[PDB]
Design an enzyme around this catalytic site. Structure first.
Site, PDB file in Angstrom:
ATOM      1  N   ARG A 194     -21.929   8.178  -9.931  1.00 51.21           N
ATOM      2  CA  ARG A 194     -22.459   6.867 -10.109  1.00 51.21           C
ATOM      3  C   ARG A 194     -23.773   6.512  -9.113  1.00 51.21           C
ATOM      4  O   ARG A 194     -24.665   5.685  -9.608  1.00 51.21           O
ATOM      5  CB  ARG A 194     -21.301   5.789  -9.728  1.00 51.21           C
ATOM      6  CG  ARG A 194     -20.160   5.747 -10.761  1.00 51.21           C
ATOM      7  CD  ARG A 194     -19.022   4.914 -10.143  1.00 51.21           C
ATOM      8  NE  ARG A 194     -18.264   4.425 -11.508  1.00 51.21           N
ATOM      9  CZ  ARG A 194     -16.892   4.059 -11.088  1.00 51.21           C
ATOM     10  NH1 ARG A 194     -16.175   4.194 -10.410  1.00 51.21           N
ATOM     11  NH2 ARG A 194     -16.464   3.699 -12.384  1.00 51.21           N
ATOM     12  N   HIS A 232     -12.344   9.149  -1.514  1.00 52.30           N
ATOM     13  CA  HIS A 232     -12.624   8.552  -2.835  1.00 52.30           C
ATOM     14  C   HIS A 232     -12.357   7.091  -2.798  1.00 52.30           C
ATOM     15  O   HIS A 232     -11.382   6.634  -2.122  1.00 52.30           O
ATOM     16  CB  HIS A 232     -11.986   9.306  -3.955  1.00 52.30           C
ATOM     17  CG  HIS A 232     -11.994   8.435  -5.064  1.00 52.30           C
ATOM     18  ND1 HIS A 232     -13.161   8.435  -5.890  1.00 52.30           N
ATOM     19  CD2 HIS A 232     -11.142   7.663  -5.617  1.00 52.30           C
ATOM     20  CE1 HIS A 232     -12.802   7.652  -7.042  1.00 52.30           C
ATOM     21  NE2 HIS A 232     -11.549   7.174  -6.933  1.00 52.30           N
ATOM     22  N   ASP A 269     -17.737   9.129  -7.603  1.00 48.34           N
ATOM     23  CA  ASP A 269     -18.626   8.425  -6.829  1.00 48.34           C
ATOM     24  C   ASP A 269     -19.997   8.741  -6.469  1.00 48.34           C
ATOM     25  O   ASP A 269     -21.073   8.052  -6.835  1.00 48.34           O
ATOM     26  CB  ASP A 269     -17.744   8.542  -5.228  1.00 48.34           C
ATOM     27  CG  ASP A 269     -16.717   8.148  -5.239  1.00 48.34           C
ATOM     28  OD1 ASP A 269     -15.738   8.849  -6.009  1.00 48.34           O
ATOM     29  OD2 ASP A 269     -16.166   7.269  -4.457  1.00 48.34           O
ATOM     30  N   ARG A 274       0.757  -1.235  -0.092  1.00 48.76           N
ATOM     31  CA  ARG A 274      -0.044  -0.046  -0.046  1.00 48.76           C
ATOM     32  C   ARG A 274       0.775   1.356   0.013  1.00 48.76           C
ATOM     33  O   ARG A 274       0.720   2.344  -0.615  1.00 48.76           O
ATOM     34  CB  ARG A 274      -0.988  -0.018   1.098  1.00 48.76           C
ATOM     35  CG  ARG A 274      -0.620  -0.794   2.331  1.00 48.76           C
ATOM     36  CD  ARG A 274       0.812  -0.137   3.371  1.00 48.76           C
ATOM     37  NE  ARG A 274       1.193  -1.153   4.072  1.00 48.76           N
ATOM     38  CZ  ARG A 274       0.772  -1.635   5.229  1.00 48.76           C
ATOM     39  NH1 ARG A 274      -0.461  -1.511   5.644  1.00 48.76           N
ATOM     40  NH2 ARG A 274       1.388  -2.839   5.758  1.00 48.76           N
TER      41      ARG A 274
HETATM   42  N1  LIG Z   1     -10.155   9.735  -9.234  1.00 48.69           N
HETATM   43  C1  LIG Z   1     -10.925   9.041  -9.912  1.00 48.69           C
HETATM   44  O1  LIG Z   1     -12.202   8.955  -9.874  1.00 48.69           O
HETATM   45  C2  LIG Z   1     -10.359   7.974 -10.768  1.00 48.69           C
HETATM   46  C3  LIG Z   1     -11.158   7.246 -11.813  1.00 48.69           C
HETATM   47  C4  LIG Z   1     -10.475   6.458 -12.692  1.00 48.69           C
HETATM   48  C5  LIG Z   1      -9.167   6.460 -12.572  1.00 48.69           C
HETATM   49  N2  LIG Z   1      -8.293   7.246 -11.969  1.00 48.69           N
HETATM   50  C6  LIG Z   1      -7.010   7.319 -11.988  1.00 48.69           C
HETATM   51  O2  LIG Z   1      -6.466   7.983 -13.201  1.00 48.69           O
HETATM   52  C7  LIG Z   1      -5.067   7.227 -13.452  1.00 48.69           C
HETATM   53  C8  LIG Z   1      -4.687   7.115 -14.803  1.00 48.69           C
HETATM   54  O3  LIG Z   1      -5.535   6.002 -15.273  1.00 48.69           O
HETATM   55  P1  LIG Z   1      -5.315   5.429 -16.536  1.00 48.69           P
HETATM   56  O4  LIG Z   1      -6.345   4.559 -16.800  1.00 48.69           O
HETATM   57  O5  LIG Z   1      -5.284   6.492 -17.687  1.00 48.69           O
HETATM   58  O6  LIG Z   1      -3.828   4.557 -16.354  1.00 48.69           O
HETATM   59  P2  LIG Z   1      -2.872   4.440 -17.258  1.00 48.69           P
HETATM   60  O7  LIG Z   1      -1.642   3.740 -16.666  1.00 48.69           O
HETATM   61  O8  LIG Z   1      -3.340   3.616 -18.550  1.00 48.69           O
HETATM   62  O9  LIG Z   1      -2.207   5.999 -17.850  1.00 48.69           O
HETATM   63  C9  LIG Z   1      -1.326   6.551 -17.012  1.00 48.69           C
HETATM   64  C10 LIG Z   1      -0.371   7.519 -17.825  1.00 48.69           C
HETATM   65  O10 LIG Z   1       0.424   8.255 -17.178  1.00 48.69           O
HETATM   66  C11 LIG Z   1       1.429   8.698 -17.707  1.00 48.69           C
HETATM   67  N3  LIG Z   1       2.506   9.003 -17.083  1.00 48.69           N
HETATM   68  C12 LIG Z   1       3.344   7.941 -16.311  1.00 48.69           C
HETATM   69  N4  LIG Z   1       4.255   8.754 -15.641  1.00 48.69           N
HETATM   70  C13 LIG Z   1       4.274   9.997 -16.258  1.00 48.69           C
HETATM   71  C14 LIG Z   1       5.016  10.942 -16.185  1.00 48.69           C
HETATM   72  N5  LIG Z   1       6.054  11.085 -15.135  1.00 48.69           N
HETATM   73  N6  LIG Z   1       4.536  12.411 -16.808  1.00 48.69           N
HETATM   74  C15 LIG Z   1       3.807  11.997 -18.055  1.00 48.69           C
HETATM   75  N7  LIG Z   1       2.708  11.013 -18.049  1.00 48.69           N
HETATM   76  C16 LIG Z   1       3.330  10.223 -17.012  1.00 48.69           C
HETATM   77  C17 LIG Z   1       1.814   6.991 -18.518  1.00 48.69           C
HETATM   78  O11 LIG Z   1       2.708   7.414 -19.796  1.00 48.69           O
HETATM   79  C18 LIG Z   1       0.224   6.688 -18.768  1.00 48.69           C
HETATM   80  O12 LIG Z   1       0.004   6.801 -20.269  1.00 48.69           O
HETATM   81  C19 LIG Z   1      -5.027   6.105 -12.528  1.00 48.69           C
HETATM   82  O13 LIG Z   1      -4.021   6.720 -11.568  1.00 48.69           O
HETATM   83  C20 LIG Z   1      -6.334   5.977 -12.034  1.00 48.69           C
HETATM   84  O14 LIG Z   1      -6.165   5.405 -10.610  1.00 48.69           O
HETATM   85  C21 LIG Z   1      -9.020   7.945 -10.949  1.00 48.69           C
HETATM   86  O1  LIG Z   2     -13.597   3.681 -11.452  1.00 51.62           O
HETATM   87  C1  LIG Z   2     -12.538   3.407 -10.972  1.00 51.62           C
HETATM   88  N1  LIG Z   2     -11.491   2.761 -11.088  1.00 51.62           N
HETATM   89  C2  LIG Z   2     -10.330   2.491 -10.511  1.00 51.62           C
HETATM   90  C3  LIG Z   2      -9.255   2.113 -11.512  1.00 51.62           C
HETATM   91  C4  LIG Z   2      -9.027   2.783 -12.491  1.00 51.62           C
HETATM   92  C5  LIG Z   2      -7.977   2.339 -13.429  1.00 51.62           C
HETATM   93  C6  LIG Z   2      -7.210   1.081 -13.109  1.00 51.62           C
HETATM   94  N2  LIG Z   2      -6.300   0.787 -14.228  1.00 51.62           N
HETATM   95  C7  LIG Z   2      -5.328  -0.008 -13.545  1.00 51.62           C
HETATM   96  C8  LIG Z   2      -4.796  -1.102 -14.594  1.00 51.62           C
HETATM   97  O2  LIG Z   2      -4.606  -0.161 -15.604  1.00 51.62           O
HETATM   98  C9  LIG Z   2      -5.678   0.399 -16.559  1.00 51.62           C
HETATM   99  C10 LIG Z   2      -6.171   1.250 -15.327  1.00 51.62           C
HETATM  100  C11 LIG Z   2      -7.331   0.452 -11.914  1.00 51.62           C
HETATM  101  C12 LIG Z   2      -8.520   0.903 -11.218  1.00 51.62           C
HETATM  102  C13 LIG Z   2     -10.591   1.434  -9.596  1.00 51.62           C
HETATM  103  C14 LIG Z   2     -11.458   0.197  -9.440  1.00 51.62           C
HETATM  104  C15 LIG Z   2     -11.719  -0.457  -8.618  1.00 51.62           C
HETATM  105  S1  LIG Z   2     -10.789   0.118  -7.280  1.00 51.62           S
HETATM  106  C16 LIG Z   2     -10.047   1.264  -8.238  1.00 51.62           C
HETATM  107  C17 LIG Z   2      -9.950   3.663  -9.843  1.00 51.62           C
HETATM  108  C18 LIG Z   2     -11.072   4.330  -9.114  1.00 51.62           C
HETATM  109  O3  LIG Z   2     -10.616   4.951  -8.262  1.00 51.62           O
HETATM  110  C19 LIG Z   2     -12.057   4.096  -9.467  1.00 51.62           C
HETATM  111  S2  LIG Z   2     -13.602   4.948  -8.795  1.00 51.62           S
HETATM  112  C20 LIG Z   2     -13.938   3.889  -7.574  1.00 51.62           C
HETATM  113  C21 LIG Z   2     -13.414   2.872  -7.097  1.00 51.62           C
HETATM  114  C22 LIG Z   2     -13.762   2.194  -6.133  1.00 51.62           C
HETATM  115  C23 LIG Z   2     -14.842   2.455  -5.518  1.00 51.62           C
HETATM  116  C24 LIG Z   2     -15.773   3.577  -5.703  1.00 51.62           C
HETATM  117  C25 LIG Z   2     -15.313   4.231  -6.805  1.00 51.62           C
HETATM  118 CL1  LIG Z   2     -16.338   5.563  -7.251  1.00 51.62          CL
END
Ligand SMILES: NC(=O)c1ccc[n+]([C@@H]2O[C@H](COP(=O)([O-])OP(=O)(O)OC[C@H]3O[C@@H](n4cnc5c(N)ncnc54)[C@H](O)[C@@H]3O)[C@@H](O)[C@H]2O)c1
Ligand SMILES: O=C1N[C@](c2ccc(N3CCOCC3)cc2)(c2ccsc2)CC(O)=C1Sc1ccccc1Cl
Ligand SMILES: NC(=O)c1ccc[n+]([C@@H]2O[C@H](COP(=O)([O-])OP(=O)(O)OC[C@H]3O[C@@H](n4cnc5c(N)ncnc54)[C@H](O)[C@@H]3O)[C@@H](O)[C@H]2O)c1
Ligand SMILES: NC(=O)c1ccc[n+]([C@@H]2O[C@H](COP(=O)([O-])OP(=O)(O)OC[C@H]3O[C@@H](n4cnc5c(N)ncnc54)[C@H](O)[C@@H]3O)[C@@H](O)[C@H]2O)c1
Ligand SMILES: NC(=O)c1ccc[n+]([C@@H]2O[C@H](COP(=O)([O-])OP(=O)(O)OC[C@H]3O[C@@H](n4cnc5c(N)ncnc54)[C@H](O)[C@@H]3O)[C@@H](O)[C@H]2O)c1
Ligand SMILES: O=C1N[C@](c2ccc(N3CCOCC3)cc2)(c2ccsc2)CC(O)=C1Sc1ccccc1Cl
Ligand SMILES: O=C1N[C@](c2ccc(N3CCOCC3)cc2)(c2ccsc2)CC(O)=C1Sc1ccccc1Cl
Ligand SMILES: O=C1N[C@](c2ccc(N3CCOCC3)cc2)(c2ccsc2)CC(O)=C1Sc1ccccc1Cl
Lengths: 331, 331, 331, 331
Positions: free
Chosen positions: D168, D192, D165, D105
């Site tokens: 949805r 979150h 969150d 973690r």
């Molecule tokens: N907050 C939310 O509700 C939420 C929801 C979904 C995903 N996310 C987060 O969004 C993030 C991205 O998800 P994704 O599916 O695009 O993942 P992904 O790994 O496909 O995309 C990550 C991108 O970041 C780029 N990257 C890595 N290091 C970098 C750097 N130093 N400078 C610039 N770019 C860099 C990588 O090249 C990659 O293209 C994840 O951490 C995921 O947990 C957040």
């Molecule tokens: O939709 C989501 N998807 C994420 C998630 C997004 C991208 C990737 N990868 C990793 C593998 O590479 C492709 C991107 C992995 C996980 C998730 C899903 C279950 S735990 C966290 C990130 C995230 O925070 C949310 S929202 C969420 C999560 C849990 C509970 C409630 C909510 Cl709203």
């Protein structure tokens, strides 16, 4: 051959019925505001305008037509005859008489009944399956009139009701709290206009009740007098009339909003006037505003707002007053 | 201890300037139609309205404010004083004197020039870096006037010019061909209004020139009398005035389209009035419509259209008569 | 009672069909690009998705559904059974095999044909009055395969064709001229892909012909090398695949633009693939791109573009080649 | 002379510093989904894209650029060097390290911290007055990390937090009640993801509290299992990942909604992550989701939600859980 024939080869000639048609009856300030808003939101594939003042009607139609380059509504038509309104999904009525200084309220309402006695039969003949949206004042009485003359089921007869009252209420609330009205949630219900009812128990931002934080909210003895917000809704309506003589933009936008929910079957909740018989102790055929769900059916559902005794009492009095007028009307 | 403080925790009280402000001067039918179109196209974070008639002005501001729930413009202001117009990115002038001779010895042109005399300095004071969009008639002369008074560079003074003329021309072309005006390309240039010039060589659908297909296009020996399309443009302008007393929607919509290009820095091409000194044998300081590239700098570039001998003579004719009026203007 | 019944009084329970349903077949990068664009343009009151891969299909459906708060499409469904597509107005087909290592072009074509032998009968079964928009490559061949199996009239079978070619071309032309692509007019016609044809004579800004003022435009003898613009279009298609492995955003926007015209009956002119027999001396059942008027009946009309001998020859060669493959197809 | 120069006369070549520029860092499914939603909603006149994978970054830029004909965002740039982000009003960070099997973690957060140790100082270098919108997971810690490295005032560092969150949640609520999510009000606050907190008391339609109607709302013993609505939020997130491998569309749309409020200074209320020290007995530098008013200065105000002791406790636990990590971070 013609230039057209030289330029363009035709595959088919056949012409379908307009699939997403809306009609505005009455091309005064209100109708025209509804018209422009509807066009700018791309809500219709065809728009029809109807009035009795022939010259004005063609003038308005042409002005709109000339704007086609900046719109996505390929066909705008107008006329005195209702054939131009055939196959409308939605029909908006904004036609009305102008009250004179030596004129009764009952006389004014009757004058608009006489107007609806002409319009409604013609709308039903050309668009039997349409939804009716009534804006003409007194909206609640004229929504009833439209319902009666058309013979439509209640779900297809929608009154503008307290949509504008609410809209204004949320603007004032928002200006008081320094927050956008979209995030300021507030419901004015019952009879449109002077006798409308603000539901203080529902007023909230981010789902936290203002009544819970401030138990004297909306009360007579409230230090801050948030009652002012509803008071100023009423006053501002008269003020606009005093200043420019009419209201257009706001009502136009609120009507477009309703149209959007209906035309796109969104099922959003809206404070509109509907058949209120059966609740809050009302036994008469009367239309009042309560939050209703709007879709391609018009009003499919209504929300059962929990009202206080004093609030329920106010709706009763309005329904009594409204039925008292309606029973003295000539059809 | 107050409801607002109970509900909302403030992080900072910081005054900032709006980032995309638009002002409309003149709150008549044209001003108001530009405003509503702009509001519904989400072009501004703030709208300011200026007029000399104070009650009408406040009426319009409030009516707009009341529709805030259905818009994405958080702030609408208005006043007699130009302080409300400060920090504008774009200022639209639609002000004009009552079309009534005998109210003053000065003619319509002269009366509108005097109106501009105290308008322009006031807006340049509060918004020294804005683009000026002139709609008021005679648009070509007044664009020059606004340019002369403001001291602004050429790129920042735009006239509505033949934008409406073309919009109306494309609507009619579209109707003859059964095609949406957006696919019917055609350019009316020169002096706005009666003396405007349709450029037949430019008219095309899908890059297929109509004149190439049909050489008699726009001549006297055309059997389909396509010259009538430009005649109707002129006729319909007078007919709208005849029928409803004014034009609003079409001009309002075309103004919003320019505002879109400008506020979003699109660099789209529009028929608007700019200084044509150096083109078509014109050596005087005159503004006529040509296709201009429109963006955040105003008119950054202009398209040099090849014109026939007849078309060139008509622009020169217009330029001579405009300069003849302007050389006798005292400031 | 349920909380739903506590909260909401139901007026009627009439179940209803979509009035503006769109179906996308194939849930890959292109398929989703179209869906998201369409959803964000508010073109449908219901979106249906189908694919053979069940796990991706459901996961894509869910993801879109979770964005509903910010969308205006109240219903998104999916499934492998085509009963989810019933009464669609537009059916977009983005489904297809990918070329394997041992695979040759002929083998790949027949494999897509085999896929259409499953999809096409299933589509017409539930939506016999839909418009078929074909995106899958080879688009011209597969538009024809859609046409043959559906039994649809040519006006309701539309190939995406040269729409993306023209989109990319107009972008580059815009970059060359410092003008928004919207104001840069150019048409790429014929066979989609490597063998497409740029119509130099129709390339213009503000109606002024680029060929006219620059006669070497289109030839090797050009000092400014404008043939590279069309060549760069081809290059960019391969380059994007090298860089990211697929194309999505550009094709999804082009398709959604085609969708808007069809759904809203705009009658705009687009470069799409259509039955070209009887044009340019072509006798075979072949689909090639020409400007088409798109509306609620699909392609109602074709713009007859006056091509040069060279251009005509290029189109006829494409037609012969396409039929050489089509003649040997088993289906 | 060049064809360009023959066609176009230039008034000025000098170019303005970006006015409404947005940057997106990270070009994965999340970054690109935000990119397209921003483009299609017309929230910027310039868009910059940044990533470390240079080949796919270029490919995405090109793909977006080929769609310019159908967009109103004229300038789209990309690059590894942050000079392409200069003068951004808003910077959206979506860059993240992927999740590995049997991974600690404290480990995943630190890997993401190091990514931010390069990104953050580069953004301030070229856009020192921007707002930061953090998307990367774990969003609550990384928002804090971004705040600490930037040196920005807390009002300018915004975590996407519980926005997805709540979105949805309101979809599921909407599905249950047969009413559009826009009309279904409900807030999920705090941390979150897994540990988010559903605020049952603020759950309403048209101001009618569901908790008041149904006191079991949110409890394990609820016969209608309305608590499953929140559990279904968490479960759907894991399901989507399982079914397609990532989640894009929904996150893209939400982020763009936040961008809209900021870019247009709307002052709407959104559930986003902000520095919460001082509220709910929390005594540490922690970012948690809470209703915030969003405008041109980011978070100017927040709504003080009344929480039950159960909700407060869950929030305090999250704060402690989050601080335990943060205090052990090397940066
Ligand atoms: N907050 C939310 O509700 C939420 C929801 C979904 C995903 N996310 C987060 O969004 C993030 C991205 O998800 P994704 O599916 O695009 O993942 P992904 O790994 O496909 O995309 C990550 C991108 O970041 C780029 N990257 C890595 N290091 C970098 C750097 N130093 N400078 C610039 N770019 C860099 C990588 O090249 C990659 O293209 C994840 O951490 C995921 O947990 C957040
Ligand atoms: O939709 C989501 N998807 C994420 C998630 C997004 C991208 C990737 N990868 C990793 C593998 O590479 C492709 C991107 C992995 C996980 C998730 C899903 C279950 S735990 C966290 C990130 C995230 O925070 C949310 S929202 C969420 C999560 C849990 C509970 C409630 C909510 Cl709203
Ligand atoms: N419901 C609301 O919240 C609300 C708000 C504002 C205005 N209104 C009402 O909307 C109406 C519109 O007012 P305006 O548009 O401000 O008034 P107006 O007098 O300018 O418009 C009335 C129009 O109705 C036309 N008309 C009259 N008889 C007709 C007939 N038999 N068939 C067709 N058209 C006919 C008239 O020619 C006139 O153009 C008014 O009754 C006003 O009270 C309602
Ligand atoms: N450019 C075009 O193609 C085009 C098309 C139509 C109309 N117009 C012109 O637009 C102008 C306005 O049209 P309208 O129908 O609104 O006219 P109008 O007379 O209704 O509006 C004029 C407004 O200007 C205001 N005004 C007068 N003096 C002022 C001052 N010193 N400062 C500020 N405001 C002042 C008046 O109070 C009035 O509200 C007219 O000149 C008309 O010829 C141009
Ligand atoms: N015409 C153009 O301008 C243009 C532009 C780009 C791409 N394309 C074409 O679009 C096609 C799709 O490209 P992509 O990147 O989305 O491909 P992809 O590899 O994602 O395949 C598309 C989808 O089709 C699905 N599919 C396969 N067989 C199916 C069946 N029998 N029923 C339903 N779905 C089925 C697959 O599961 C896959 O999800 C390609 O053939 C490409 O050549 C055309
Ligand atoms: O804005 C409004 N304006 C109206 C109104 C509209 C048009 C005209 N004319 C007369 C002259 O001819 C032009 C139209 C006259 C009055 C109004 C204003 C004060 S009493 C009634 C009608 C109406 O119902 C509302 S809303 C409202 C009204 C009262 C209290 C509260 C509300 Cl929300
Ligand atoms: O539509 C128009 N209408 C105008 C016009 C606008 C407002 C008013 N009033 C009078 C009553 O008070 C309100 C303002 C009077 C006239 C016009 C029409 C014929 S001559 C001038 C002004 C104008 O320039 C155009 S466009 C045009 C005009 C002539 C020829 C060709 C074109 Cl495209
Ligand atoms: O952008 C395009 N990309 C395609 C293409 C798209 C997806 C895939 N895969 C393979 C890997 O799996 C994902 C899908 C493979 C190819 C292309 C690119 C170079 S040749 C054909 C299809 C296509 O037709 C165009 S447009 C085009 C093509 C050639 C010339 C001119 C134009 Cl405008």
């Amino acid at each position: 051959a013609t230039l057209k024939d030289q330029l363009i080869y035709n595959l088919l000639k056949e012409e379908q019925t307009p699939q997403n048609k809306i009609t505005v009856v009455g091309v005064g300030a209100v109708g025209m505001a509804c018209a422009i808003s509807i066009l700018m939101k791309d809500l219709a594939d065809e728009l029809a305008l109807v009035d009795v003042i022939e010259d004005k009607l063609k003038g308005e139609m042409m002005d709109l037509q000339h704007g086609s380059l900046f719109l996505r509504t390929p066909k705008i038509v107008s006329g005195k005859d209702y054939n131009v309104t055939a196959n409308s999904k939605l029909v908006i009525i904004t036609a009305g008489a102008r009250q004179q200084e030596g004129e009764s309220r009952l006389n004014l309402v009757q004058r608009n009944v006489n107007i609806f006695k002409f319009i409604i039969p013609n709308v039903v003949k050309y668009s039997p399956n349409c939804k009716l949206l009534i804006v003409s004042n007194p909206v609640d009485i004229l929504t009833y009139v439209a319902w009666k003359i058309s013979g439509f089921p209640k779900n297809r007869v929608i009154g503008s009701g307290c949509n504008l009252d609410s809209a204004r209420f949320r603007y004032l609330m928002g200006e008081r709290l320094g927050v956008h009205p979209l995030s300021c949630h507030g419901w004015v219900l019952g009879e449109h206009g002077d006798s409308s009812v603000p539901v203080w128990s529902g007023m909230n931002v981010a789902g936290v009740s203002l009544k819970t934080l401030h138990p004297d909210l909306g009360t007579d003895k409230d230090k801050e007098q948030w009652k002012e917000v509803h008071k100023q809704v009423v006053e501002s309506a008269y003020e606009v009339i005093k200043l420019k003589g009419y209201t257009s933009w706001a009502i136009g936008l609120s009507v477009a909003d309703l149209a959007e929910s209906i035309m796109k079957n969104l099922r959003r909740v809206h404070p509109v006037s509907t058949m209120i018989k059966g609740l809050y102790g009302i036994k008469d055929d009367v239309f009042l505003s309560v939050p209703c769900i709007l879709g391609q059916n018009g009003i499919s559902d209504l929300v059962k707002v929990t009202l206080t005794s004093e609030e329920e009492a106010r709706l009763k009095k309005s329904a009594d007053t409204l039925w008292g007028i309606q029973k003295e009307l000539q059809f």
